[PDB]
Structure 1
Amino acid sequence: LPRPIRNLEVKFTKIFINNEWHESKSGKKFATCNPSTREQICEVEEGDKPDVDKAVEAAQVAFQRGSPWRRLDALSRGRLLHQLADLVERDRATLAALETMDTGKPFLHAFFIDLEGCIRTLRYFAGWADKIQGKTIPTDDNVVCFTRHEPIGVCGAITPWNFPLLMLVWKLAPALCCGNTMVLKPAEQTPLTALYLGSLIKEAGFPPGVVNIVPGFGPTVGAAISSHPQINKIAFTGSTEVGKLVKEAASRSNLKRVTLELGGKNPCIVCADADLDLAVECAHQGVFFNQGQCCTAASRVFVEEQVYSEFVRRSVEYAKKRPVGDPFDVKTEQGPQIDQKQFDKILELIESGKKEGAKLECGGSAMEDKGLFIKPTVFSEVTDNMRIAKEEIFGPVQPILKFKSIEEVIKRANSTDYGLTAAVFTKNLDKALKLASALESGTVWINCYNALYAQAPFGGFKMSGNGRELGEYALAEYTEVKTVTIKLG
């Protein structure tokens, strides 16, 4: 309902350290592109290790014992997340616009989804600030024993492009309610909203240095953070391989604590006794939502022989109806893909489906060649050791498979290494619970998809991540336990 802001100008483009804007010590810069209209948006600073080293020495001092930040009341600190979520509320249209320009997200989605889940998250942890509680333990008669949940220190964050501002805030909200200091590196493809937030961080009244942002490239700024011996903890949302790199690097350097979220082969089981019109509608915007690029995307769609053939028919129509086009269009649901090797990579496995035996159903190739739009594709007769079904596609592709027994899909669903999310659609009570118990996903939606809450944790099983975000469990990743044991005369 808000008016699209189509010629909004990029006002913020630099490294943000100690609440100040900076030109990269390198002097270099780099540009960010608008995937909707292949066009250059703006040129931002190109950070590197020297810049990163600059920001950490800032967070180190902002975290120093006795600093203005450390002294703050636990509630006063929680009072800043509030009033920084307030500011996000104010400039909600500005940020949603920035997010669309740089990502091709339908401006509708960026408003009611991305920035919604962002202001929500900022508020949940704003309340956790003064409720971070340790324990008092019974020990011996003569001993007092208790535990304090102290902040970890300088925490680095490295986010992806599929949800630039959201995935970032998921780490900033808990890390700051716990009393840490942060050095952030946003994905180069989408650094606009990360830096704009930097302004509000200053406007909200945060002490200088508690948060710093250094835009740059993965190897350049990213790796420099994962290894910095002064950063005490890392948070990474990205590719499973880079995830293996970050943790291994942090291992070699100072044994800093690391948490990872990597997405995976998220199964979408659909039993014979489901509300198909629901299962189709959710499994549809679950697979296709946000141009298809999402960690929780529905890679493999299982269906029972009882409604397998009927399902494939139902899905086909939804896919076609899904409008593709301008992001700032008010009637769009899917815009362009992110960048080039993505547009190419996606179109690759599409034919890999054609070329491997998968019965296509809708939209074999791309369209609207000016931009990077892809025809929402659907696949049938998919089998376990195919490519569309075995890999992590990103663009809109809905490979649908067949299954027969509940134990069959329980086994075939866990056959992967990527247990991040799993949907299940049944009106049955035991089928719904028996599945939810044996499925090895970190999250298990039932009769719904993409049901994230700043209250419920989100994390990966197996090779999908380490630890959880987005819950009360999120505080565990931003606090170090200290045991205090006193003996009395």
Structure 2
Amino acid sequence: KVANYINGEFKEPSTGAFQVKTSPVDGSKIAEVPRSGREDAREAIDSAFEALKAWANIPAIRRAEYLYKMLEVFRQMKEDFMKILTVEGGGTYRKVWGEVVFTERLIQNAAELARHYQGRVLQSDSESTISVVFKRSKGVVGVITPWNYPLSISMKKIAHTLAVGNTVVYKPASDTPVTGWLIAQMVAKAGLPKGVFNLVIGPGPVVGEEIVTHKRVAHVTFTGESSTGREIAAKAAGTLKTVTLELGGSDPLIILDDVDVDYAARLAVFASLFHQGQICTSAKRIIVHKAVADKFIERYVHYVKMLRIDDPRKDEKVDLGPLINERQVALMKEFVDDAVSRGGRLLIGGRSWGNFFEPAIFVDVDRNFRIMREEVFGPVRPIVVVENDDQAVEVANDTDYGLSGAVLTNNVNRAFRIAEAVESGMFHINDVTFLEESHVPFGGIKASGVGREGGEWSFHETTYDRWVTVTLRTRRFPIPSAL
């Protein structure tokens, strides 16, 4: 039985309302989770607001101890996190294993950096003036998270936000409440001061909107669909609260003619399809140079044929799991259908059963396919063929999304001209598009959102600069002129 965590106490919703949650894998019953109203949200927010000053003006080193204790506790709960991440989220073994490991590195990173967030000492154009800039935490920070990689993304947000001295109200993804409960578990066993961190499970339209519009929330960091992020930004405007938005993207994977082709294909398969393409930074549009295009397509398709779809609980070598739910399969079917009816050649896949969806691969697409124009969050992928670098770029940019991208090539000048030219918040040469480290500035441009997360960048999102001076000389003043 899952509960909210508010002011250091595990409890019901005040509305008493409850909701059943079942696995995307077999549909079997998982847990009963709260479904919370504005009362619950309001309360969590308050608890955080009152914990805020105590939490922020204690020494950084101390918050860091807390975070290391959290690392401790996490290292003990790894098993349960892998388990829930598979059962609730439909992650494969190797996927959730990765998610857990990464999460560890994340928490650690926050602890590591807390003591080192630095203001600046400044030169003055005034004489006898001492002029510095301090870093201060924003306040209560709303944390709203996706369902695909819910442990790692949640923890990046939460750990880093806590480290530099903000408190946290955290409304997990609707489709992954158990994971969020487990995080709350972890935090509570770490023994953080009551109210410093709060879990509220519930509907976005209810909990989320209180979190986003409330007077006392200083900042919101969101990860989800671009519609939701957009309106969240609009509502955040009312209270002048600042936001960090990772809105997802359709990432170009450019492959040039000088590549080892086999490798390029394996890489593409891993990047475009891992976790069923349900990655925000998944490689959602494969752009390939004409000269290698036929061999590439052959080998890509070859390894896509090798992918094993199964119950992720079966064993460690299961490649692909379910989509998170029925809606996702609906939408993926739509994408495939649209693809065929527009004249696209289905090279493979397209079968679905329950929540599972075979990777579906298309060539012969134009820019008017929905799978070119939209974020396909799931395993349906285009392969576009381009005649030169100019064209590869032009395609890679033809999209509303700015999140990430990659290029495979051995030519340094091509690697760099392409990397410079592709409009993306992140770009990787000779690697997957979803490359992520804990301390690096993760984020998009264009429709993919605003802000960066990880390390000092997360700290930048949740803190502000305070210019402070001490003026050491007496001075004469211009008014009244009579003096």
What's the TM-score, normalizing by structure 1? 0.94
The one-letter amino acid paired with 1:348 is E
Q: Does 1:239 align with 2:225?
A: yes
Q: Does 1:179 align with 2:168?
A: no
Number of aligned positions between the proteins = 470
What is the alpha-carbon distance in structure 1 between the residues aligned to residue 374 and residue 198 of structure 2? 36
Q: Does 1:294 align with 2:275?
A: no
What is the alpha-carbon distance in structure 2 between the residues aligned to residue 109 and residue 298 of structure 1? 16
Q: Does 1:473 align with 2:453?
A: no
CA contact (8 A) 2:261 2:295 kept: no
CA contact (8 A) 2:277 2:284 kept: no
What is the alpha-carbon distance in structure 2 between the residues aligned to residue 226 and residue 452 of structure 1? 27
**Residue 88 of structure 1: aligned partner:** 74
What's the TM-score, normalizing by structure 2? 0.95
**Residue 51 of structure 1: aligned partner:** 40
1:267-301 per-residue CA deviation (whole Å, 9 max, x = no partner) reads: 11111111222221121111111022110111211
Q: Does 1:340 align with 2:326?
A: yes
**Residue 271 of structure 1: aligned partner:** 256
1:54-78 per-residue CA deviation (whole Å, 9 max, x = no partner) reads: 00110011013xx2x2343211111
C-alpha displacement of 1:205: 2.3
Partner of residue 95 from structure 2, selected from 109, 112, 116? 109
1:335-393 per-residue CA deviation (whole Å, 9 max, x = no partner) reads: 11111111111111111111111111111332xx3x31112211112222222222211
1:161-214 per-residue CA deviation (whole Å, 9 max, x = no partner) reads: 111111111111211110110000001110111111112212212101100010
Secondary structure (helix, strand or coil) at the match of 2:291 reads coil
**Residue 365 of structure 2: aligned partner:** 382
Secondary structure (helix, strand or coil) at the match of 2:373 reads coil
Q: Does 1:320 align with 2:309?
A: no
CA contact (8 A) 1:154 1:181 kept: yes
**Residue 479 of structure 2: aligned partner:** none
CA contact (8 A) 2:117 2:456 kept: no
What is the alpha-carbon distance in structure 2 between the residues aligned to residue 275 and residue 457 of structure 1? 30
1:283-432 pair list within 5 angstroms: 283-329=268-314, 330-366=316-352, 369=353, 371-432=354-415
The one-letter amino acid paired with 1:145 is S
C-alpha displacement of 1:448: 1.1
1:209-252 per-residue CA deviation (whole Å, 9 max, x = no partner) reads: 10001000110111111101110000000000000010100102
C-alpha displacement of 1:433: 0.9
**Residue 72 of structure 1: aligned partner:** 58
Secondary structure (helix, strand or coil) at the match of 2:101 reads helix
Secondary structure (helix, strand or coil) at the match of 1:198 reads helix
**Residue 5 of structure 1: aligned partner:** none
**Residue 151 of structure 1: aligned partner:** 137
C-alpha displacement of 1:147: 0.6
Q: Does 1:439 align with 2:428?
A: no
Secondary structure (helix, strand or coil) at the match of 2:436 reads coil
Partner of residue 25 from structure 1, selected from 14, 18, 26? 14
**Residue 83 of structure 2: aligned partner:** 97
Structure 1 stretches of 4+ moved >3 Å = none
Partner of residue 119 from structure 1, selected from 101, 104, 124? 104
Secondary structure (helix, strand or coil) at the match of 1:203 reads helix
What is the alpha-carbon distance in structure 2 between the residues aligned to residue 74 and residue 346 of structure 1? 47
Secondary structure (helix, strand or coil) at the match of 1:184 reads strand
The one-letter amino acid paired with 1:312 is I
Secondary structure (helix, strand or coil) at the match of 2:5 reads strand
With over 3 angstroms needed to count, the CA separation of the structure-2 counterparts of 1:455 and 1:70, relative to structure 1, is closer
C-alpha displacement of 1:100: 1.0
CA contact (8 A) 1:347 1:365 kept: no
1:451-487 per-residue CA deviation (whole Å, 9 max, x = no partner) reads: 2101221101111111101132221101111111221
- Which is further off, 100-109 or 47-56? 100-109
CA contact (8 A) 2:288 2:392 kept: no
CA contact (8 A) 2:86 2:92 kept: yes
What is the alpha-carbon distance in structure 2 between the residues aligned to residue 107 and residue 93 of structure 1? 11
C-alpha displacement of 1:141: 2.1
CA contact (8 A) 2:25 2:311 kept: yes
What is the alpha-carbon distance in structure 2 between the residues aligned to residue 129 and residue 361 of structure 1? 50
Q: Does 1:451 align with 2:440?
A: no
The one-letter amino acid paired with 1:33 is T
Secondary structure (helix, strand or coil) at the match of 2:431 reads coil
What is the alpha-carbon distance in structure 2 between the residues aligned to residue 59 and residue 237 of structure 1? 21
CA contact (8 A) 1:235 1:260 kept: yes
The one-letter amino acid paired with 1:58 is S
Where in structure 1 are there 5+ consecutive unaligned residues?
1-11
**Residue 191 of structure 1: aligned partner:** 177
What is the alpha-carbon distance in structure 2 between the residues aligned to residue 463 and residue 116 of structure 1? 30
What is the alpha-carbon distance in structure 1 between the residues aligned to residue 373 and residue 448 of structure 2? 15
Where in structure 2 are there 5+ consecutive unaligned residues?
474-483
CA contact (8 A) 2:289 2:392 kept: no
**Residue 4 of structure 2: aligned partner:** 15
Identity of aligned residues (%): 34
What is the alpha-carbon distance in structure 1 between the residues aligned to residue 444 and residue 401 of structure 2? 7
CA contact (8 A) 2:56 2:137 kept: no
**Residue 477 of structure 2: aligned partner:** none
C-alpha displacement of 1:411: 2.0
What is the alpha-carbon distance in structure 1 between the residues aligned to residue 200 and residue 46 of structure 2? 13
- Which is further off, 114-123 or 450-459? 450-459
CA contact (8 A) 1:275 1:425 kept: no
Partner of residue 42 from structure 1, selected from 23, 31, 40? 31
Secondary structure (helix, strand or coil) at the match of 1:86 reads helix
The one-letter amino acid paired with 1:456 is V
C-alpha displacement of 1:107: 2.5
The one-letter amino acid paired with 1:461 is I
Q: C-alpha root-mean-square deviation of aligned residues, in Å?
A: 1.2
- Which is further off, 180-189 or 445-454? 445-454
